[PDB]
Write a protein that binds this ligand. Structure first.
Ligand SMILES: CCCCCCCC/C=C\CCCCCCCC(=O)O[C@H](COC(=O)CCCCCCC/C=C/CCCCCCCC)COP(=O)(O)OCCN
Lengths: 71, 83
């Protein structure tokens, strides 16, 4: 005496189902990354130049200590 | 002018690794001849006392040889401290 009951889609329909590709760009420009790399290299070069000059001075100092002790 | 521009553009599009390698090698070849610190590097190398400085026998005719390390004569590494 009841209505016919069956597995049916809801009245109206279903919400949209996405199927198309989604691969967003999400990236910097090439110039930006190249510039960051070059700037990092230059900063490292300057730091290493200072440190190596100081190291050469220290080496000279301890070499002179050896020279003083040699006789 | 334009031929080299098109060739460089094609190379940058097809072989960026080779373009970068050739640029780096060319810079490494060229730049040292134009730098003022190469002389400083040579002088730093010459200033390192690996062996003992043997004193010279005084004969009374060397105004430019010190008789003591703290004497004003002889080479000075005052330039090196500020470098
Ligand atoms: C003056 C610098 C000299 C010293 C620095 C160099 C250091 C080391 C670099 C050289 C290593 C060996 C390089 C060998 C080159 C072989 C070229 C070649 O035949 O390869 C071609 C590919 O390359 C070519 O197309 C021919 C040459 C293309 C141009 C390469 C660079 C030429 C010069 C451009 C750079 C100029 C300097 C930079 C200036 C910056 C711009 C302002 C074939 O590729 P396949 O792997 O077989 O292909 C299979 C898949 N398809």
């Amino acid at each position: 005496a009841s209505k016919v009951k069956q597995d049916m889609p809801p009245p109206g329909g279903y919400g949209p189902i996405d199927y198309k590709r989604n691969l967003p760009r999400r990236g910097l420009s090439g110039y930006s990354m190249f510039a960051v790399g070059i700037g990092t290299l230059l900063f490292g070069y300057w730091s290493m130049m200072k440190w190596n000059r100081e190291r050469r001075r220290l080496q000279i100092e301890d070499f002179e200590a050896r020279i003083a002790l040699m006789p | 002018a334009g031929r080299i521009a098109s060739f460089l553009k094609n190379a940058w599009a097809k072989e960026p690794v080779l373009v970068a390698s050739f640029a780096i090698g060319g810079l490494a070849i060229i730049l040292p001849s134009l730098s003022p610190y190469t002389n400083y590097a040579i002088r730093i190398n010459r200033a390192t006392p690996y062996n003992y400085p043997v004193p010279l026998r005084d004969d009374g005719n060397m105004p430019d040889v010190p008789s003591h390390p703290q004497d004003p004569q002889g080479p000075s590494l005052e330039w090196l401290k500020n470098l």
